[PDB]
Design a protein around this ligand. Structure first.
Ligand SMILES: NCCNC(=O)N1CCC[C@H](C(=O)Nc2ccc(Cl)c(F)c2)C1
Ligand SMILES: *[C@@H]1O[C@H](CO)[C@@H](O)[C@H](O)[C@H]1NC(C)=O
Ligand SMILES: *[C@@H]1O[C@H](CO)[C@@H](O)[C@H](O)[C@H]1NC(C)=O
Ligand SMILES: *[C@@H]1O[C@H](CO)[C@@H](O)[C@H](O)[C@H]1NC(C)=O
Ligand SMILES: *[C@@H]1O[C@H](CO)[C@@H](O)[C@H](O)[C@H]1NC(C)=O
Ligand SMILES: *[C@@H]1O[C@H](CO)[C@@H](O)[C@H](O)[C@H]1NC(C)=O
Ligand SMILES: *[C@@H]1O[C@H](CO)[C@@H](O)[C@H](O)[C@H]1NC(C)=O
Ligand SMILES: *[C@@H]1O[C@H](CO)[C@@H](O)[C@H](O)[C@H]1NC(C)=O
Ligand SMILES: *[C@@H]1O[C@H](CO)[C@@H](O)[C@H](O)[C@H]1NC(C)=O
Ligand SMILES: *[C@@H]1O[C@H](CO)[C@@H](O)[C@H](O)[C@H]1NC(C)=O
Ligand SMILES: *[C@@H]1O[C@H](CO)[C@@H](O)[C@H](O)[C@H]1NC(C)=O
Length: 340
């Protein structure tokens, strides 16, 4: 057939258990339809489509949905919002992101890039066409992208413009790294155990890959030097508890006696700078007992340092804050068009 680049309102789908008390299931149970029981994907032969992950409206729409999900599902005791302040009940909630499918209404279709080393921008020569994206888990975090998909070939570097150092860099890993984070039975004391062996290996590979994009220059990793706790640390939510974990051991250029298990120190903060921008909020103290999540690190968000134009090296620090980049990391291979 034929089509034309177009933006329209998408709808969502899920496998939300209607009996579930969990907040992602509850939101999906009443804001999304059931997943396509017979999903039909059909490859388009001799067709080349130009995709642009950084200028894609599916990002902004999914981002809209996640603010909605969080605003109805999270119960802070007090919300400080731009001069207003609201007290409330803050019961414990059950939190565990479920995949969400995004789907075009009639008159529109979703194009999907299957070029395996597609970097997100430019043309794609193996294009399919779907009614619905795949199941995307909306995991909220900084620096480390958790529980996502992997690049099926090489490690991929994505940025709207690598020459601009204000542009976030998204590295898509081809090998997942486990991050196992516990708060066992100070109650906010917590920690993350990562296999230093595997981690160091793939960071060297990132290093390798990054050097390609930077004329063989020297690649150096550093901790963030400026920003709120949420972006200077690895922030994420595990079972309703906001985790803040120190990344300094995972970005030491020493090991790019150090192959055991890295133990990142962590704190469970009750007062957080909300990622939606609204302000700052307070929550109740953590649950009794063992609070643990085992996640897959599938990508890394990084920022290059400015002012290295005639310098010997390039400096990269873990990044985050704009969580459209997180949706970016899974919606890059997709584009919405209207059948003409
Ligand atoms: N390049 C964009 C700059 N980003 C920015 O200015 N923000 C405003 C202040 C910090 C905000 C934040 O990231 N919050 C947060 C909360 C909970 C979790 Cl779990 C998490 F992963 C993150 C983001
Ligand atoms: C196109 O992508 C499909 C699905 O990812 C995969 O089988 C292969 O890489 C490509 N197939 C052809 C015929 O080009
Ligand atoms: C992505 O690929 C396009 C060519 O399709 C190229 O113009 C662009 O520089 C590449 N970007 C990165 C970050 O590799
Ligand atoms: C972690 O990664 C493996 C493959 O590396 C995958 O099979 C598994 O489902 C992933 N776990 C989660 C929770 O996504
Ligand atoms: C991941 O990509 C790197 C190149 O970036 C490659 O050397 C390595 O073999 C890949 N690993 C896997 C498991 O695909
Ligand atoms: C990328 O960023 C640099 C520096 O901000 C800018 O000079 C340039 O115009 C941008 N785009 C390209 C294609 O280089
Ligand atoms: C995660 O760590 C805890 C304590 O550090 C341990 O009991 C548990 O077996 C670990 N789980 C995995 C999957 O490694
Ligand atoms: C670290 O990961 C490697 C795989 O590369 C594996 O040999 C080992 O199980 C892991 N380390 C520990 C202490 O379990
Ligand atoms: C960058 O270094 C690699 C090292 O393997 C070399 O092969 C390559 O020639 C260098 N750069 C360019 C632009 O060729
Ligand atoms: C992370 O830990 C290092 C020491 O290991 C410390 O110097 C640094 O201040 C910590 N980061 C933050 C944001 O506090
Ligand atoms: C990643 O997925 C696993 C398995 O579904 C889950 O236990 C864990 O909480 C997830 N991690 C995050 C940060 O949501």
């Amino acid at each position: 057939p034929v089509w034309k680049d177009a933006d329209t309102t998408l709808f969502c789908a899920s496998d939300a258990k209607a009996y579930e008390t969990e907040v992602h299931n509850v939101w999906a149970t009443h804001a999304c339809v059931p997943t396509d029981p017979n999903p039909q994907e059909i490859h388009l032969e001799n067709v080349t489509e130009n995709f642009n992950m950084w200028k894609n409206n599916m990002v902004e729409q999914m981002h809209e949905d996640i603010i909605s999900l969080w605003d109805q599902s999270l119960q802070p005791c007090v919300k400080l919002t731009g001069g207003s302040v609201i007290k409330q009940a803050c019961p414990k909630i059950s939190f565990d992101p479920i995949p969400i499918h995004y789907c075009t209404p009639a008159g529109y279709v979703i194009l999907k890039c299957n070029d395996k080393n597609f970097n997100g921008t430019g043309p794609c020569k193996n294009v399919s066409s779907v009614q619905c994206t795949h199941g995307i888990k909306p995991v909220v975090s900084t620096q480390l992208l958790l529980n996502g998909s992997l690049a099926e070939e090489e490690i991929i570097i994505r940025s709207e413009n690598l020459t601009n150092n204000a542009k976030t860099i998204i590295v898509h890993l081809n090998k997942s790294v486990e991050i196992n984070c516990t708060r066992p039975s100070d109650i906010r004391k917590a920690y993350c155990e990562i296999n230093g062996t595997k981690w160091n290996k793939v960071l060297k590979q990132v290093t390798e890959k990054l050097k390609e994009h930077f004329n063989n220059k020297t690649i150096i990793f550093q901790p963030p030097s400026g920003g709120d706790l949420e972006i200077t640390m690895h922030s994420f939510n595990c079972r309703g508890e906001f985790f803040y974990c120190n990344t300094t051991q995972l970005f030491n250029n020493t090991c790019i006696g150090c192959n055991g298990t890295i133990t990142l120190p962590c704190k469970i903060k009750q007062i957080i700078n909300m990622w939606q921008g609204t302000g700052q909020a307070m929550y109740a103290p953590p649950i009794d007992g063992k609070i643990n999540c085992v996640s897959n690190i599938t990508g890394i968000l990084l920022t290059r340092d400015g002012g290295a134009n005639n310098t010997s090296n390039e400096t990269f620090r873990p990044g985050g804050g704009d969580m459209r980049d997180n949706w970016r990391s899974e919606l890059y291979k997709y584009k919405v068009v209207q059948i003409e």
